């Protein structure tokens, strides 16, 4: 299985994960490839924000799935 | 020649070439209803060359649902003629015109053509011409809670900037013989496969410094590959790489060709089967209108819905679409055909205006090509929505009633909202509320709060403020403008000038917060957001947060007892550089700007403040001697800025400026190079000044040089302002006085029981007694943008540029220095419009009182890449306390004002928990490790008395509750997390 | 931040640091006064160094402001007491306890880093004349860090 993560700035990240991996492992991989601490990562799949402690199979994340990595903004 | 005093924030987003191209483009807008007027407003604020409007239809009352430039006295007049007058005022550099008749050949005058409120046949006729003549064509529709956008920029569109990001750059550590570029220690390049980079300052491989881009093959977060550089050399060290962004060719299809085989943009991946449905539905709408003299299906009418679905089936069969039609969704499109919501108009107008800017400037990645959107989760479910309640009542809210009904209108009209901030998002929110009819009922009310006043750079993205309003309060002007838009709000809006923070809890207290229905944030900082979030959590009020940054934006919703609060999640913090890097070894312009800001603070605001406070505090020295780490610095500062260097004229001010120039740009560098010569080697034998450390060079003053003279003028003017003298800008006096200065000689020094204490005491007593000076004060220099025109930004620019020339860094001009030092946030009108639209779409969910967490959507978007994402809010966590389910955010203990012992016994008896720590505010009221005597003193006191005693400050008369944080552990010794306590005074 | 501060304080209390002892001032939780004993195998032997710790309003999401209060002759500590530590400026994460900070400071005192100094004068003395650096450190600790 292989998944893609798209940032809010257009960058694309390719991750090699298994269907049984926890969201914590995926966040650690994203930290390794990006340097973003897991507590500051907001992942979205099919309109659901992925939460720590659960596995990918809970969200029906299969191969070639696309996640979105987003963040909040402070202007106004 | 762009007006940087008005487009200051927009230049940080677009640029100079982009706006130069933008100001040479003509935009035609067909249709002047809510969507059309929103697009025209955003375009006028953006700054295109001119806008031409075409809408000869007479005004009707229902049009007032989303058209905010129409009034009840304009019924029967063509919409363009009544809208041009209001649009002409938004921007004085953008003429707005009207055409009473349109011809095909007349379309060649315009750079972009936007089409709204037009049938499909007319759209085909227009596009058949614009496509072959290479004119950008955008078509937008808004039907109830559904929206569509279509872009066609020609067959050979050229995009110069795709993602809109700043070019990437980095410092190398080694380039092997096979092009394996390695970054510095634990530094990430951030590139991606297929990118182009160009190198400079590469030692050992000078050929790579020519500047020819090379393909990048990312092999890891720290290293990448560029190819084979065998011929260019063997191995290279150090250097800096910078990304190169290349143009792209995007090819679009015409509308006639696009109808058969469209290409969709998906605003939500949770519903990927819908856009094919909307593609058929909108065409069926057009056919139905063509079959009924341009009459859309009536609201919640079933015969029209059946006929519309027959048209949908016919169209789907004709186009050979292998799509199974979802009857419910298509009939929903039919029911809301005549809907006209200001929120959907705002959202789509922001998006379409951004597309227009893309067409004119050739930047960012356009929509390619169909963008179908819906917010069907906002449809009320707690009220009656039928043909009876959705029929028009001959009022200005017909467009909204056609979607929601009259009962929901009554619900909206009795809202009591509270809006924090009245900037750009605040103005958009107020306009949306005025159009929607919020708080126009007998029990409605709106409260606006904002402590700032109108400036010149705020008018561009804030369309309610005019150049005649400069200097007034933002909230008052916004309230008056929106009362003009909707006269029914006269007397229903109250505006304050209070900063929302810990010091204004006497105004926004329990009584104020009990009557509200919801709170909407329109702030620009995180501290105020967190404070308002805590207040909403305590009072259990819904909160609507939204933020923007250039072309990016987000919106979040906080619902009591359902979702987590705003402060339950973290965001990346602002970067703070190491003190060693800032002080001695900078290698970037940001480091030098930070150093210059610190120099300003410590040279014009710290010493003056210390001097002023010394003359007032009688016991300052007593605490300073034992508390501050280096009282010697304080004493020397007071002496120097009080007695030793008191100026009277301006010549001595210029001499002092020259002295400081030598101090900070010539002598410290010499000392540093005496300590660490240019040929020194580290403890490992490697060169010292290699890589992140750049060897500095002392600067010798030269009056003719622009930078040195600018620094001298800025520093002298700031010093004069400090000492209240008459500054001058005539270069003759500066030239005369700087030539007679002989710098004192400077030579670096190598260095080489209670004397120090006695020395400090002697210095202290040497100062004049406090009674010597009474009523004498000096004015510290504060930081602003030409509001206090003491050359603040100019001084910082000169200091930073001089220090950059010290380390051979590339200097930055005043624009970038203002951007960095001022911490300005790039702002766009389109992003503001989109976030306001999303927030107002969530507001109707909040009004309806939806209880399921899947019915709310937090929204994120980036308009530079055409990305939209929505996700359900995170539910608040639960916990177990005493074998009961407790919410960790929205639950609290409500107790009377009881003695500390009674509170402890209550927690021991009811919750079965042992209290270990108890604190209120910033004070530790009780802790298990305190000595028995202290506790025995503090046990029989009430909580209010205990807090007053510990904080040494009586509670205010308006204070009606206390919030306590308690940490307690179970019987077994396992620490238990419990909610906060709410003591009722 | 009160709960986090109290939890860290209790964790310190349960297991003594031995070589360090940090605790609040008066009844205020956003201001601590820590103490450190110089390593035996270092020029700072037999010295007691006091530190002031100010917890920001956003703790642990913002690093604590730790400043020396005594006078110490060290390459990475300047006259104002500022400490050159990566975990206090930009490497701070909401998972580091004050015990970790005190261990890091003790390690810093154990071996200075003159390759990236904060006080170039002392770094130059350390790189050139080690014996003079040792004597100056001993004199400073016996004149300011004893009593
Ligand atoms: P954008 O920067 O365009 O406008 C921001 C507006 O928010 C107001 N504001 C900021 N911070 C506060 C607090 N703490 N209380 C009330 N209002 C605030 C600014 O005055 C701008 O109007």
CA dihedral sign, ordered B860, B521, C57, B982: negative
Using the beta-carbon criterion (under 8 Å), do B165 and A9 form an inter-chain contact? yes
Minimal CA separation from C96 to chain B, in Å? 16
CA distance B55 to B50: 17
DSSP B751: -
Which of C108, C137, C124, C112 lies closest to C45 in space, CA to CA?
C137
Beta-bridged to residue B868, according to DSSP, are B861
> A17-21: long-range contacts (C-beta < 8 A, 24 or more apart)?
A17/A56, A18/A56, A19/A55, A19/A56, A19/A57, A19/A61, A19/A62, A20/A55, A20/A56, A20/A57, A21/A55, A21/A56
By DSSP bridging, strand B981-984 and strand B893-895 are parallel
CB contact set of B644 (below 8 Å; sequence gap of 6+): none
The residues pairing with A66 across neighbouring beta strands, listed in sequence order, are A4
CA distance B981 to B962: 8
Domain B1-114 fold: FAD/NAD(P)-binding domain (3.50.50)
Contacts of B391 (CB under 8 A, 6+ apart): B299
Q: Give the contacts of C108 (CB within 8 A, at least 6 positions apart).
A: C74, C76, C83, C85
Answer yes or no: are the C-beta atoms of B164 and B864 closer than 8 Å. Answer: yes
Q: Which of C27, C76, C114 sits opposite B683 (nearest CB)?
A: C114
- The pair of structure tokens assigned to B143 is 């039907």
Report how many domains make up chain C. Answer: 1
Q: Which atom of ligand 1 is nearest to the CA of A76?
A: 1
Contacts of B569 in chain A (CB under 8 A): 42, 72
Matching CATH topology for B115-165+245-410 and B411-569+825-891? yes
| Strand-pair category, B552-558 with B878-881 | unpaired
Q: Which residues on chain C are in Cβ contact (under 8 Å) with B580?
A: 76, 84, 116-118
Q: Is the Cα torsion angle B929, B930, B936, B940 positive or negative in sign? A: negative
Its sign, for the CA torsion B681, B685, B688, B690, is positive
Q: State the smallest CA–CA distance between residue C38 and chain B in angstroms.
A: 19
For the record, the structure tokens of B736 come out as 């005369």
- If 0-12 CB within 10 Å is exposed, 13-18 middle and 19+ buried, where does residue B603 land? buried
Half-sphere exposure of B901 (CA within 13 A, CB side): 7
Name the closest residue on chain B to residue A12, using Cα atoms: B192
Nearest residue to A59 (alpha-carbon basis) of B792, B576, B270, B433 = B270
B957 touches chain C (CB under 8 A): no
For chain B, the structural domain boundaries read 1-114, 115-165+245-410, 166-244, 411-569+825-891, 570-824, 892-985
Which residue, judged by its Cα, is nearest atom 4 of ligand 1? B423
> What is the distance in A from the centroid of ligand 1 to the CA of B501?
12
* CA B445/CA B417 separation, integer angstroms: 7
What is the domain extent for residue C48?
Answer: 2-144
CATH topology of domain B411-569+825-891: Rossmann fold (3.40.50)
Q: Which residues contact B758 (CB under 8 A, 6 or more apart)?
A: none
CATH number of the domain at B166-244, please?
Answer: 2.40.30.180
Nearest-by-Cβ selection for B869 from A35, A39, A68? A68
From B345, B359, B368, B361, select the one nearest B10 (Cα to Cα).
B361
Cα(B904)–Cα(B967) distance, integer angstroms: 12
Question: What interhelical angle do B814-821 and B792-806 show, nearest 10?
Answer: 100
DSSP reduced 3-state for B945: helix
DSSP state of C85: -
| β B370-374/B416-420 pair status | unpaired
The answer to whether the beta carbons of residues B656 and B719 sit under 8 Å apart is yes
Ligand 1 atom with minimal separation from the B461 CA: 3
* Mutation probe of ligand 1 site: the residue of B10, B419, B447, B452 with most atoms within 8 A of C-beta: B452
Structure tokens at B323: 């799509």
Q: Say if residues B811 and B805 touch (Cβ distance below 8 Å).
A: yes
**Alpha-carbon span B150 to C86, nearest angstrom:** 51
Tell me the CATH number at C18.
3.10.110.10
Q: Which of B32, B159, B580, B829 is catalytic?
A: B580
The closest alpha carbon to B428, from B468, B466, B478, B477, belongs to: B478
What are B241's two structure tokens?
A: 């790489």
Structure tokens at B673: 């190079």
With beta carbons less than 8 A apart as the criterion, state whether C67 and C58 touch.
Answer: no
How far apart CA B444 and CA B982 sit, in angstroms, is 30
CA atoms within 13 A on the CB side of B486: 28
The verdict on whether residue B125 carries a ligand-binding annotation is no
User: What CATH architecture applies to the domain B892-985?
Assistant: Roll (3.10)
> Is residue B8 within 8 angstroms of chain A, CB to CB?
no
Query: DSSP H helical segments within chain A, as ranges?
Result: 23-34
Quick one: CA dihedral B177, B179, B184, B185, positive or negative? Answer: negative
Instruction: State the helix-helix crossing angle for C98-110 and C2-14, rounded to 10 degrees.
Output: 60
Phi, psi of A49 (to 5 degrees): -85, 120
Which residues lie below 8 Å from residue B456, measured CB to CB, with a gap of 6+? B5, B6, B467, B470
As beta bridge partners, residue A12 has A6
| R_g over Cα of chain C | 16
Q: Measured at the alpha carbon of residue B311, what is the angle toward residues B306 and B315, in degrees to the nearest 5?
A: 150
Of B524, B831, B832, which is best to mutate to test ligand 1, by the most ligand atoms within 8 angstroms of its C-beta?
B524
B964 vs B904: CA distance, rounded Å: 13
The fold of the B570-824 domain, in CATH, is Arc Repressor Mutant, subunit A (1.10.10)
B667 is in an annotated binding site: no
CB B4 within 8 Å of CB B815: yes
Q: Give Cβ neighbours of residue A74 (< 8 Å, ≥ 6 apart).
A: B524, B525, B526, B529, B547, B549, B571, B825
Q: Which residue has the tokens 């085989």?
A: B261
Distance from the alpha carbon of residue B522 to the mean position of ligand 1, in angstroms: 7
Q: Which CATH class, in words, describes the domain spanning B115-165+245-410?
A: alpha beta
- C38 as an active site residue: the answer is no
Q: Indicate the resolution in Å.
A: 2.9
Q: Which residue of chain B has the CA closest to A50?
A: B874
Name the token pair of C70. 């005594």
Task: Pick the catalytic residue from C37, C53, C72, C84.
Answer: C84
Which residues, at least 6 apart from B752, have a Cβ–Cβ distance to it below 8 Å? none
Q: Which ligand 1 atom is at minimum distance from the Cα of B500?
A: 15
> Does residue B245 sit in helix, strand or coil?
coil
Q: CA-CA distances (angstroms) from residue C131 to B660, B685, C122, C126, C135? A: 36, 21, 12, 8, 6
Q: Which two tokens stand for residue B651?
A: 């010549």
Cα separation, B369 vs B382, whole angstroms? 37
Using CA atoms, how far residue C43 sits from B315, B337, C68, C71, C133, in Å, is 89, 84, 17, 14, 9
B neighbour chains, 3+ CB pairs within 8 Å: A, C
Q: Is B424 annotated as a binding residue?
A: yes
Q: Which chains touch C (3 or more CB pairs under 8 A)?
A: B
Q: Is B459 in the pocket of ligand 1 (CB under 6 A)?
A: no
Instruction: For residue B917, list chain C residues with Cβ-Cβ distance below 8 A.
Output: 6, 10
CA distance C104 to C102: 5
**Helices (DSSP H) in B640-754: which residue ranges?**
651-662, 668-675, 706-723, 731-738
C33 close to C22: Cβ distance less than 8 angstroms: yes
SS3 B825: coil
> What is the residue-wise DSSP string for B463-496?
TT--GGGTTSBHHHHHHHHHHHHSGGGTTTEEEE
Q: With 0-12 CB in 10 A as exposed, 13-18 as middle and 19+ as buried, what is B505?
A: middle
Q: Which residues contact B688 (CB under 8 A, 6 or more apart)?
A: B676, B680, B681, B682
Angle between helices C130-144 and C120-128 (to 10 degrees): 130
Report CA(B694)–ligand 1 centroid distance (Å).
Answer: 41
- Residues with Cβ within 8 Å of C89's Cβ and at least 6 positions away in sequence, in order, are B576, B577, B578, B579, C63
CB neighbour burial string for B709-736, b if at least 16 within 10 angstroms, e if fewer: bbbbbbbbbbbbbbbebeebeeeeebee
Residue of A nearest to B425 (CA): A76
CA-wise closest residue to A30 among A57, A68, A58: A68
CA distances B511 to B514, B539, B580, B656, C128, Å, are: 5, 11, 51, 57, 70
Rounded CA-CA distance B601/B592 in Å is 14
| Residue bearing tokens 């949770």 | B270
Cis-peptide into B369, omega within 30 deg: yes
Pocket test for ligand 1, best of A73, A74, A76 (most atoms within 8 A of CB): A76
CA-nearest residue of chain C to B567?
Answer: C58
Contact A73 B827 (CB under 8 A): no
Concatenate the DSSP letters of all residues of B129-196 into one string: HHHHTT-EEEEEEEETTEEEEEEE--TTEEESBSS-PPPPEEEEEEE-TT-EEEESTT------TT-E
* Chain C residues lying within 8 Å of B570, measured CB to CB: 61, 94
Which chains border A (3 or more CB–CB pairs < 8 Å)? B
User: Which residue from A8, A72, A74 is facing B862, i.e. has the nearest CB?
Assistant: A8
- Pair B792, B601: CB distance under 8 Å: no
Structure tokens at B479: 């309230």
Answer whether B12's CB lies under 8 Å from B826's CB: yes
Q: How far is CA B907 from CA B903, B923, B983, in A?
A: 6, 20, 14
Determine phi and psi for B875, rounding to 5 degrees.
-70, 145
Are the CB atoms for B426 and B463 separated by under 8 Å?
no
CB B21 within 8 A of CB B136: no
Rounded CA separation B453/B431 (Å): 19
**Cα–Cα distance between B111 and B113 in angstroms, integer?**
7
- Cβ distance C86 to B578 less than 8 Å, yes or no, reads yes
CB within 8 A of B617, min separation 6: which ones?
A: none
Cβ B526 under 6 angstroms from ligand 1: no
In angstroms, the CA B41 to CA B811 distance is: 38
Spatial neighbors of B458 by CB under 8 A, at least 6 apart, are B423, B424, B465, B474
| Residue whose CA is at the smallest distance from ligand 1 atom 20 | B452
Alpha-carbon distance of B451 to B465, in angstroms, equals 15
Q: Which residues on chain C are in Cβ contact (under 8 Å) with B923?
A: 27-29
CA of B421 to the centre of ligand 1 (A): 5
Cα gap B458→B954, rounded to integer Å: 42
How many C-beta atoms lie closer than 10 Å to residue C108's C-beta? 17
Q: Are strands B416-420 and B26-30 parallel, antiparallel or unpaired?
A: unpaired
Angle at B247 between CA B245 and CA B251, to 5 degrees: 145
Compute CA distances B813 → B8, B793, B795, B820, whole Å. 14, 10, 12, 11
How far is the C-alpha of B38 from the C-alpha of B67, rounded, in Å? 8
Instruction: List phi, psi (to 5°) of B210.
Output: -65, -40
Residue among B973, B972, B967 at smallest CA distance from B907 = B967
Residue pair A21/A28 in contact (Cβ under 8 Å)? The answer is no
Tokens for C60?
A: 């642990």
Note if the bond before B370 is cis, omega within 30 degrees: no
Q: Which residues, 6+ apart, have CB-to-CB distance to B860 below 8 Å? A: A8, A44, A68, A70, B552, B553, B554, B868, B869, B870, B871
> What angle in degrees, to the nearest 10, is found between the helix axes of B302-318 and B327-335?
120
* Angle at the Cα of C119 from the Cα atoms of C114 and C120, rounded to 5 degrees: 65
Q: Establish if B201 touches chain A: CB-CB under 8 angstroms.
A: no
Atom 10 of ligand 1, nearest CA residue? B523
Residue nearest to atom 8 of ligand 1 (CA): B421
Round the CA-based radius of gyration of chain B to a whole number and report it: 33
Distance between CA B842 and CA B834 in Å, rounded?
Answer: 13
Q: Which residue has the tokens 């009795």?
A: B414
- Between CA B834 and CA B350 the distance in angstroms is 5
* C-chain residue closest to B753, CA distance: C143
Give the number of beta-carbon pairs within 8 Å between A and B.
102
Residue B500 annotated in ligand binding: yes
Phi/psi for B141 (5° steps) reads -135, 145
Sort B177 into a burial class: Cβ within 10 Å, 0-12 / 13-18 / 19+.
middle
Do B927 and C6 count as a contact with CB atoms less than 8 A apart?
yes
Pull the structure tokens for residue B493.
């809006």
d(CA B653, CA B642): 15
The secondary structure of C49-63 as a DSSP string is: EEEEEE--TTTTSS-
Pick from B233, B58, B34: nearest CA to B144: B34
Gap positions in chain B, given as the residue before each gap (C–N > 2.5 A)?
752
Instruction: Give CA–CA dist B783/B793, Å, rounded.
Output: 8
What chain A holds in terms of domains, given with CATH numbers, is 1-71 (3.10.20.90)
d(CA B340, CA B801): 54
Q: What are the distances in angstroms from CA C11 to CA B927, B930, B977?
A: 14, 16, 16
Of B331, B335, B330, the C-alpha closest to B298 is B335
Of B421, B526, B860, nearest to A8 by CB-CB distance is B860
CA–CA separation, B33 and B236 (whole Å): 63
C82 secondary structure, DSSP code: B
Decide if B425 touches A, using CB distance below 8 A.
yes
CA B837 to chain C, closest CA, distance in angstroms equals 32
Instruction: Point out the residue among C3, C117, C121 whose CB comes nearest to the CB of B967.
Output: C3
Between CA B923 and CA B962 the distance in angstroms is: 13
Q: Is B188:B221 a contact under the CB 8 Å cutoff?
A: yes
The β-bridge partners of B172 are: B183
Q: What are phi and psi of B545, to 5 degrees?
A: -105, 145
**First-residue to last-residue Cα distance in chain C:** 34
């Amino acid at each position: 299985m292989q998944i893609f993560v798209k940032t809010l700035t257009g960058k694309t990240i390719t991750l090699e994960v298994e269907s049984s991996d926890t969201i914590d492992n995926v966040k650690s991989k994203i930290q390794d490839k990006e340097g973003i601490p897991p507590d500051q990562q907001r992942l979205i799949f099919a309109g659901k924000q992925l939460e720590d402690g659960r596995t990918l199979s809970d969200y029906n994340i299969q191969k070639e799935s696309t996640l979105h990595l987003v963040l909040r903004l402070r202007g106004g | 020649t762009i007006d940087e005093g008005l487009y200051s924030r927009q230049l940080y987003v677009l640029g100079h070439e982009a706006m130069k191209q933008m100001s040479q483009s003509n935009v035609l807008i067909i249709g002047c209803k809510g969507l059309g007027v929103e697009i025209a407003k955003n375009v006028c604020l953006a700054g295109v060359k001119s806008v031409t409007l075409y809408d000869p239809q007479p005004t009707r009352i229902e049009d007032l649902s989303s058209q905010y430039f129409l009034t009840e006295d304009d019924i029967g007049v063509p919409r363009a003629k009544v809208t041009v007058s209001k649009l002409a005022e938004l921007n004085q550099y953008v003429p707005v015109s009207v055409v009473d008749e349109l011809s095909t050949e007349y379309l060649k005058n315009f750079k972009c053509v936007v089409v709204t409120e037009t049938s499909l046949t007319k759209q085909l006729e227009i596009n058949d011409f614009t496509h072959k003549n290479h004119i950008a064509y955008i078509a937008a529709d808004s039907r109830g809670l559904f929206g569509s956008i279509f872009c066609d920029f020609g067959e050979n569109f050229i995009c110069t900037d795709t993602d809109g990001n700043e070019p990437l750059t980095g410092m190398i550590a080694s380039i092997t013989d096979d092009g394996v570029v390695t970054m510095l220690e634990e530094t990430r390049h951030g590139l991606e496969n297929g990118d182009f980079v160009k190198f400079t300052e590469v030692k050992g491989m000078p050929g790579l410094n020519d500047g020819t881009p090379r393909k990048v093959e990312v092999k890891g977060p720290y290293t990448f590959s560029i190819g084979s550089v065998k011929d260019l050399g063997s191995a290279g060290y150090n250097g800096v790489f910078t990304q190169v962004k290349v143009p792209t060719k995007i090819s679009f299809k015409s509308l006639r060709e696009s109808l058969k085989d469209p290409e969709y943009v998906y605003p939500d991946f949770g519903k990927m089967m819908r856009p094919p449905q909307y593609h058929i539905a909108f065409q069926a709408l057009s056919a139905f209108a063509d079959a009924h003299e341009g009459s859309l299906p009536r609201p919640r009418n079933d015969i029209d819905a059946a006929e519309f679905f027959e048209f949908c089936k016919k169209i789907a069969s004709t186009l050979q679409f292998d799509v199974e039609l979802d009857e419910k969704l298509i009939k929903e499109i039919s029911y809301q055909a005549r809907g006209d919501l200001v929120a959907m108009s705002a959202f789509l107008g922001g998006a379409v205006a951004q597309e227009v800017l893309k067409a004119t400037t050739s930047k960012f990645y356009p929509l390619k090509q169909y963008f179908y959107f819906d917010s069907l989760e906002s449809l009320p479910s707690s009220v009656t929505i039928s043909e009876e309640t959705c029929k028009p009542r001959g009022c200005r809210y017909d467009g909204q009633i056609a979607v929601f009904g009259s009962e929901f209108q009554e619900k909206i009209a009795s809202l009591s909202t509270f809006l924090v901030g009245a900037g750009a998002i605040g103005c958009e929110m107020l306009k949306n509320w005025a159009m929607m009819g919020v708080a126009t009922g007998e029990s409605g009310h709106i409260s606006v709060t904002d402590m700032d006043s109108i400036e010149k750079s705020n008018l561009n993205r804030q369309f309610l403020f005019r150049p005649r309003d400069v200097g007034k309060l933002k909230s008052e002007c916004a309230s008056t403008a929106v009362s003009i838009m909707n006269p029914s709000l006269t007397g229903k809006i109250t505006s304050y000038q209070e900063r929302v923070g810990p010091e204004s809890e006497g105004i926004f207290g329990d009584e104020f917060f009990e009557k509200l229905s919801l709170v909407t944030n329109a702030l620009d900082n995180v501290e105020a957001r967190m404070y308002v979030d805590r207040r909403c959590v305590f009072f259990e009020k819904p909160l609507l947060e939204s933020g923007t940054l250039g072309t990016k934006g987000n919106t979040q919703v906080v619902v009591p007892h359902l979702t987590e609060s705003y402060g339950s999640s973290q965001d990346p913090p602002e970067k703070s550089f190491p003190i060693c890097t800032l002080k001695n070894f900078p290698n970037r312009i940001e480091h030098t700007i930070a150093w210059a800001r610190d120099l300003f603070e410590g040279l014009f605001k710290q010493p003056i403040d210390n001097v002023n406070m010394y003359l007032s505090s009688p016991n300052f020295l007593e605490t300073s001697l034992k508390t501050s780490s280096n009282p010697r610095e304080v004493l020397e500062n007071i002496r120097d800025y009080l007695v030793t260097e008191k100026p009277l004229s301006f010549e001595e001010c210029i001499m002092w400026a020259r002295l400081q120039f030598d101090k900070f740009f010539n002598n410290n560098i010499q000392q540093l190079l005496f300590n660490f010569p240019k040929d020194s080697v580290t403890s490992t034998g490697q060169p010292f000044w290699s890589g992140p450390k750049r060897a500095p060079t002392p600067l010798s003053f030269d009056i003719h040089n622009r930078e040195h003279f600018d620094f001298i003028v800025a520093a002298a003017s700031l010093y004069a302002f400090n000492y209240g003298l008459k500054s001058e800008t005539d270069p003759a006096i500066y030239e005369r006085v700087l030539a007679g200065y002989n710098p004192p000689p400077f030579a670096p020094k190598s260095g080489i029981a209670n004397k120090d204490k006695q020395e400090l005491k002697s210095i202290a007593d040497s100062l004049p007694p406090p009674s010597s000076l009474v009523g004498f004060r000096l004015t510290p220099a504060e930081f602003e943008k030409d509001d206090d025109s003491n050359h603040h930004i100019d001084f910082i620019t000169a200091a930073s540029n001089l220090r950059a020339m010290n380390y051979d860094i590339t200097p930055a001009d005043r624009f970038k220095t203002k951007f960095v030092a001022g911490k300005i946030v790039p702002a766009m009108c389109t992003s503001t419009a989109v976030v306001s639209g999303l927030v107002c779409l969530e507001l109707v969910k909040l009004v309806d009182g939806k209880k399921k967490i899947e019915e709310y959507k937090n929204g994120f978007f980036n308009l530079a890449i055409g990305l939209f994402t929505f996700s359900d809010p995170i539910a608040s966590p639960k916990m177990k306390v005493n074998g009961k389910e407790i919410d960790k955010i929205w639950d609290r203990y409500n107790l009377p004002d009881c003695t500390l012992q009674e509170l402890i016994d209550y927690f021991q008896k009811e919750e079965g928990l042992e209290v270990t720590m108890l604190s209120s505010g910033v004070s530790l009221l009780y802790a298990n490790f305190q000595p028995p005597k202290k506790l025995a003193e503090r046990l029989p006191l009430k909580i209010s008395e205990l807090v007053e005693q510990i904080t040494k400050k009586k509670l205010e008369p308006f204070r009606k509750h206390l919030v306590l944080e308690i940490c307690c552990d179970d019987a077994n010794g396992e620490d238990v997390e419990v909610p906060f306590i709410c003591i009722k005074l | 931040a009160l709960k986090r501060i109290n939890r860290e304080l209790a964790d310190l209390g349960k297991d003594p640091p031995s070589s360090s002892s940090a605790g609040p001032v008066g009844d205020d939780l956003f201001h601590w006064q820590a103490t450190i004993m110089g390593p035996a195998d270092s020029p700072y032997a037999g010295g007691v160094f006091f530190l002031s710790i100010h917890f920001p309003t956003d703790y642990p999401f913002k690093p604590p402001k730790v400043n020396f209060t005594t006078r110490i002759y060290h390459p990475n500590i300047n006259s104002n007491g500022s400490i050159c530590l990566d975990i206090l400026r930009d490497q701070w994460s909401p998972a580091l306890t004050i015990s970790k900070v005190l261990l890091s400071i003790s390690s810093l005192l154990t071996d200075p880093n003159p390759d990236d100094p904060l006080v170039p004068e002392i770094a130059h003395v350390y790189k050139t004349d080690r014996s003079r650096y040792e004597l100056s450190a001993r004199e400073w600790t016996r004149k300011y860090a004893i009593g």
